[PDB]
Amino acid sequence: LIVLNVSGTRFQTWQDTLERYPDTLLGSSERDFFYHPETQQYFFDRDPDIFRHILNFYRTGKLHYPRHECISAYDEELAFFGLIPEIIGDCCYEEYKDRRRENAE
Amino acid sequence: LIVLNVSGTRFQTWQDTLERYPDTLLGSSERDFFYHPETQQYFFDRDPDIFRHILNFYRTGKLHYPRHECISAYDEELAFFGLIPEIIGDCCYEEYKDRRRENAE
Amino acid sequence: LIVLNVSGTRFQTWQDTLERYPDTLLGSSERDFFYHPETQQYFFDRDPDIFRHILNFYRTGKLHYPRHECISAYDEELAFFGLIPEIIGDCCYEEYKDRRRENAE
Amino acid sequence: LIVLNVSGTRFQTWQDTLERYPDTLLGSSERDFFYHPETQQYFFDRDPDIFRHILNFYRTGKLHYPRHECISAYDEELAFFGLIPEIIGDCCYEEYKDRRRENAE
Ligand SMILES: [Zn+2]
Ligand SMILES: [Zn+2]
Ligand SMILES: [Zn+2]
Ligand SMILES: [Zn+2]
C-alpha cells in the first residue's frame, strides 16, 4: 500500500494502480520528488477534497466532476497532477463543459 | 469494531451491524477477500466519500442520495457493494429518480 | 481533549465545550453509554459528515444546515443527539424551512 | 511538517507556507496560543470542512468559496483566522458576492 498524504488527509492506493497511467505525476518518477523517507509516504500540499477525484481516475480511467467544487480549483488540481487533457466521463462531461464556459465569460 | 479502510479513509462499524444485510458485499463472506491480516482491517480502493452512504444503509436499511455527487459514480458504488436493487429512502427517491433519467437522456 | 469517534471519523472537542448544553446527548450523562474504556473514546455509528454540524453547535449555540445534505437524514441526526428543538441560525433558517416543507409534500 | 488539528481532522502544512502571509492567525505568533506541547500540534475547535479553504489560501494567496457551504459560517471562519479582508479568487468572487447579498436581505 502506497500512502499519499494530501495536506493531512491520508489516501492509500496500490503502486500497480497508479502505474496504470504512466504519464501523470503519480504514475511516474515525478512522484519520487514528494516522498518522505522518514514517514514512508508521499506528501502533497494540495486540496484533500478534490484529490479524491484524482485518485479515482486511476481505477476507472475516467474522471468525475463535483458540481459543488469550483471549476478553476478543480482544473488546477488536474493540471498539477498531469491528468491532461482531462478525460471527464460522459456522466459528468456536460456539467464540466458548462461550468468551464460560465467561468470564462 | 470492524475497520473498513476505503482508499485511506477509516470507517468503523460492528460485525453485527453489517450482518444485518446478508446478501451484500460487506454483510457476507465476499468481504473476506478484502481483509488484510497484517493490519487487521479490510481495504477497498473505492470512493471514500460515497462510502458513507453505503455504510449508513446498514443502520437504517435505507439509502440516502447526495445531490452533489454524480449519479453514475453513486450507482457504481452501490453495484460494487451489492446494494442491489437500491432501496432509496422516500426522502431521496425523487431526486435520485430524476437524476437517473437526466443522466440517461 | 474528548475523542468522539463517529463511524471511523475522529472528532475532538473539550468536555467544557460539550457541557455548555446540558440537555443534549453529548453534554449529559447519556454520553457515558457510548464510551469505550479500551480506547479512551466515545463511539457513534452515526453519519460522520453531518456530525460536523452537531459539534459546531456547541461552540456557537447555533446550527447551520448543509444544503447538499438530505433534510431527513439531517433531522434524524439532530433528533438522535438531542438537539431538539433545532435552533437553526438565521443564515440557514429559510433554506431549512423550505426543504422541510418540500420533503413533507 | 506542522500539524493543524481542527476538531479532530488532521491537516499538515509547512511553516514556510504559513509564514507566506504574516498578518493572519496561522502565519503569525497568534498561532502559538493554540499549540499543544504534549502532542506537538496546534488544535482548533473550528469547522474542519471549511478549514480546507483557509489552508489552501496560503499556497495560492487566493480564496475559493464552496457553494454548498453557508456563507455566514464561511465568513466566520475567515474572520477568525484573520483572512481579512477576504481575497476571493475571480473564479469564486461573483457567487460569494451574490450569496453575501442574499444573506443580508
Ligand atoms: Zn460522473
Ligand atoms: Zn434521504
Ligand atoms: Zn448558516
Ligand atoms: Zn474559485
Curated annotation (Swiss-Prot), chains A, B, C, D:
Result when mutating residue 64 to A: Abolishes tetramerization and assembly of a functional channel
Q: In which tissues is it expressed?
A: Detected in brain cortex, hippocampus, dentate gyrus, thalamus and cerebellum. Detected in neurons from the primary visual cortex. Detected in the supraoptic nucleus in hypothalamus, in hippocampus and the habenular nucleus of the thalamus. Detected in the bed nucleus of the stria terminalis. Detected in dendritic fields in the hippocampus CA1 layer, in stratum radiatum, stratum oriens, stratum lacunosum-moleculare and stratum pyramidale. Detected in dendritic fields in the hippocampus CA3 layer and in dentate gyrus.
| Outcome of mutating residue 32 to M | Abolishes interaction with KCNIP1
Modification after translation (UniProt): Phosphorylated by MAPK in response to signaling via the metabotropic glutamate receptor GRM5.
* Residues the entry annotates as binding Zn(2+): 64, 70, 91-92
Write down the superkingdom of origin: Eukaryota
Q: What's the effect of swapping residue 91 to A? A: Abolishes tetramerization and assembly of a functional channel
Induction (free text): Down-regulated in response to hypoxia lasting about 15 minutes, a treatment that leads to spontaneous convulsive seizures in these pups.
Q: Where in the cell is it found?
A: Cell membrane; Cell projection, Dendrite; Synapse; Perikaryon
Which residues lie within the region annotated Interaction with KCNIP1?
A: 30-49
Note the subunit structure.
Homotetramer or heterotetramer with KCND1 or KCND3. Associates with the regulatory subunits KCNIP2, KCNIP3 and KCNIP4. Interacts with the regulatory subunit KCNIP1; this interaction mediates the capture of both the N- and C-terminus of KCND2, preventing N-type inactivation and stabilizing the S6 conformation, thereby accelerating closed state inactivation and recovery. Interacts with DPP10, DLG4 and DLG1. In vivo, probably exists as heteromeric complex containing variable proportions of KCND1, KCND2, KCND3, KCNIP1, KCNIP2, KCNIP3, KCNIP4, DPP6 and DPP10.
Domains: what does the record tell us?
The transmembrane segment S4 functions as a voltage-sensor and is characterized by a series of positively charged amino acids at every third position. Channel opening and closing is effected by a conformation change that affects the position and orientation of the voltage-sensor paddle formed by S3 and S4 within the membrane. A transmembrane electric field that is positive inside would push the positively charged S4 segment outwards, thereby opening the pore, while a field that is negative inside would pull the S4 segment inwards and close the pore.
UniProt similarity note: Belongs to the potassium channel family. D (Shal) (TC 1.A.1.2) subfamily. Kv4.2/KCND2 sub-subfamily.
Q: Other remarks?
A: The transient neuronal A-type potassium current called I(SA) is triggered at membrane potentials that are below the threshold for action potentials. It inactivates rapidly and recovers rapidly from inactivation. It regulates the firing of action potentials and plays a role in synaptic integration and plasticity. Potassium channels containing KCND2 account for about 80% of the neuronal A-type potassium current. In contrast, the potassium channel responsible for the cardiac I(to) current differs between species; it is mediated by KCND2 in rodents.
Please give the function described in this protein's UniProt entry. Voltage-gated potassium channel that mediates transmembrane potassium transport in excitable membranes, primarily in the brain, but also in rodent heart. Mediates the major part of the dendritic A-type current I(SA) in brain neurons. This current is activated at membrane potentials that are below the threshold for action potentials.
Put simply, this protein is called A-type voltage-gated potassium channel KCND2
Provide the organism lineage as a comma list. Answer: Eukaryota, Metazoa, Chordata, Craniata, Vertebrata
Q: In terms of the whole protein, what range is present?
A: 42 to 146 of 630
